[PDB]
Amino acid sequence: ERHKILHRLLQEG
Amino acid sequence: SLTERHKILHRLLQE
Amino acid sequence: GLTEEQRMMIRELMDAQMKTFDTTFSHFKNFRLPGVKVSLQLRGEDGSVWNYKPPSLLPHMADMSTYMFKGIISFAKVISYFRDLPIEDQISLLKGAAFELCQLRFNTVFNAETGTWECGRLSYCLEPMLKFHYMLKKLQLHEEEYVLMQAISLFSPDRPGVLQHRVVDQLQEQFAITLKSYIECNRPQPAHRFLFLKIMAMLTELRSINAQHTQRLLRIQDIHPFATPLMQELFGI
Amino acid sequence: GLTEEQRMMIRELMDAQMKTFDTTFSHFKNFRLPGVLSREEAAKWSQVRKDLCSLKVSLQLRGEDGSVWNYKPPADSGGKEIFSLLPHMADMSTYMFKGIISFAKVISYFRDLPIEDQISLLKGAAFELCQLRFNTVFNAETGTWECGRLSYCLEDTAGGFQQLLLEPMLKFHYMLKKLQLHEEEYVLMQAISLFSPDRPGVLQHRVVDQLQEQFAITLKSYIECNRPQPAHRFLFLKIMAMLTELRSINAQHTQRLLRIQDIHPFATPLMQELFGIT
Ligand SMILES: Cc1sc2c(c1C)C(c1ccc(Cl)cc1)=N[C@@H](CC(=O)OC(C)(C)C)c1[nH]nc(C)[n+]1-2
Ligand SMILES: Cc1sc2c(c1C)C(c1ccc(Cl)cc1)=N[C@@H](CC(=O)OC(C)(C)C)c1[nH]nc(C)[n+]1-2
């Protein structure tokens, strides 16, 4: 959860 | 005459 | 070395100038901006500067001129001799002298070494208009002389629509006599020779520059709309 | 010549760059700008002043008509004014960071890594790749980063060029530009920076170290094949030395950024994640 934005940006296509 | 053609100018003079 | 009537005349004029001339443009707000040949500098309190270099500025200048015009209407309203005139003559006098008094006020912030009108938070950097500004600045006038020039222009009896010609004429003469006396008793340096007659001639030149600008704008407004509602009233558009 | 494994490596990096680097900044559309007509605490304010005085840039905005709005920052008085450019730079940096994340995402070698190492590699290399991308738009004759309609102009002082070289970030940009690198060398530099095995938080140290070496070998081969002139004998080692200097500038900028953030919050949510700000 410390990297919510990074996780989302890495998941998107 | 001049008063109706110069409504803003008349307003600014009165205020 | 003036009569009290004359010394009082200058006090009312100078107090009016102080109260109605926002020299720093500290209250000029909600104005349109170029891109949002004159160069515009906008200086914030912090010392930061936004500079506009031209390739659109006409909207901004219309807002700035209208702001200056509002200050000039306020100047006239706070002078006893103007307030006592019939309202129709007040209107006629302001329609004919608005451009002239703005140019006189702009001359007091004109820097002839840089060609820049330094209006505090705003600066305008660069025609018979330019020539007027360089020639008037060379005279090194005091605030008292500028404010009397504004009065002589304001109280012009020959303005279109003026009805009390003689009242306005007699008031103008008293301002002109006061200007003449001010210079004799307060300015002996030989650089200011014929200063009174030179000022009176500059006013005649400003009258012609005013005529040429009115005709220009009455034609341009047809094609490009820019004049604010007040400008449309003042210039008969 | 280059091996086809190597030619394909470069092709994938170059496609990633083309797809994720908005060189014209034409899609950087929404950003803040400085306003128009605008004991330990005091020691911290002092150091931040010395941090912010290190890089003086003016902002130029060019309209489609050819007109230019130029913003000159204030001189250091007593506070607040020294931060007038920070919102804009935060938006500019965040825009660039998104581009770097997108670059890394399309690289096969990066996608296959565990996600927490992906995050660790990006947190450690984000500033470096942005600076490398910024070097490609740096005009060394005018001291200006040309970002489409936006331009960032180094404010020239009494010392001139030699004064600018006192700042390690500025000396970096001048020295790298002088190497006159090709697009392919730039993108390989970005790959070597991204795949640094020694960033904090990287668990798969050996895998990243081996990948970093394959990019370095590909760079060495490219230079040998396309720049055979004996004038480029040491070009590869010169690039690597620039990357070593970029790591030192990265550490200093991180420390500087953190101090500024402590006394005046400016970091966007994405920046906060990249730099560890709570
Ligand atoms: C759109 C508009 S409205 C306007 C002007 C413009 C451009 C011009 C003007 C017009 C023509 C040229 Cl050849 C130059 C300037 N001047 C201003 C005042 C001004 O700006 O004064 C200094 C120059 C600061 C002294 C003014 N006064 N009254 C009017 C109606 N205007
Ligand atoms: C608010 C922010 S966010 C930021 C910076 C600032 C100020 C600074 C910076 C930080 C500290 C000091 Cl003393 C000076 C500058 N540099 C930029 C680089 C940039 O965009 O500027 C050039 C285009 C290269 C000029 C950058 N990269 N990554 C980040 C997070 N930042």
Residue numbers in the entry:
A (entry chain C): 685 to 697
B (entry chain D): 682 to 696
C (entry chain B): 142 to 177, 210 to 228, 238 to 308, 321 to 431
D (entry chain A): 142 to 179, 193 to 432
Authors' own words:
Of the receptors known to regulate CYP3A4 transcription, PXR is the main ligand-dependent CYP3A4 regulator and is renowned for its highly promiscuous ligand binding pocket. To differentiate between PXR activation and BET inhibition, we show that JQ1 binds directly to the PXR ligand binding domain (LBD), induces recruitment of transcriptional coactivator to PXR, exhibits selectivity for human PXR over mouse PXR (mPXR), and can be blocked by a PXR antagonist. Because a PXR agonist is expected to induce recruitment of transcriptional coactivators (i.e. SRC-1), we assessed interaction of purified PXR LBD with a 23 amino acid SRC-1 peptide and found that JQ1 induced SRC-1 recruitment.
To investigate the binding mode of JQ1 to PXR LBD, we solved the PXR LBD-JQ1 co-crystal structure in the presence of coactivator SRC-1 peptide. Consistent with previously reported structures, the asymmetric unit contained two PXR LBD (chains A and B) and two SRC-1 peptides (chains C and D). In both PXR LBD chains, the thienotriazolodiazepine core and tert-butyl acetate group of JQ1 were clearly resolved, but weaker density was observed for the chlorophenyl appendage. While the tert-butyl group was anchored in an aromatic cage made up of F288, W299, and Y306 that has been shown to trap a large proportion of PXR ligands, the chlorophenyl was positioned near a void and oriented toward alpha helix 2 (α2), which is highly flexible and not observed in certain previous structures. When residues within 5 Å of JQ1 in chain A were analyzed, we observed a void between α2 (S208 and L209) and α3 (L240, M243, and A244) that may allow the chlorophenyl and additional groups to freely move. Indeed, JQ1 clearly has at least two binding poses since two different modes were observed between the two PXR LBD chains. This plasticity and differential positioning of the tert-butyl acetate moiety illustrate how binding by (−)-JQ1 is possible, as there is sufficient space for either enantiomer to bind. The flexibility observed in the PXR LBD-JQ1 co-crystal structure contrasts with the constrained binding poses in bromodomain-JQ1 structures, highlighting the structural features that allow PXR to bind diverse molecules.
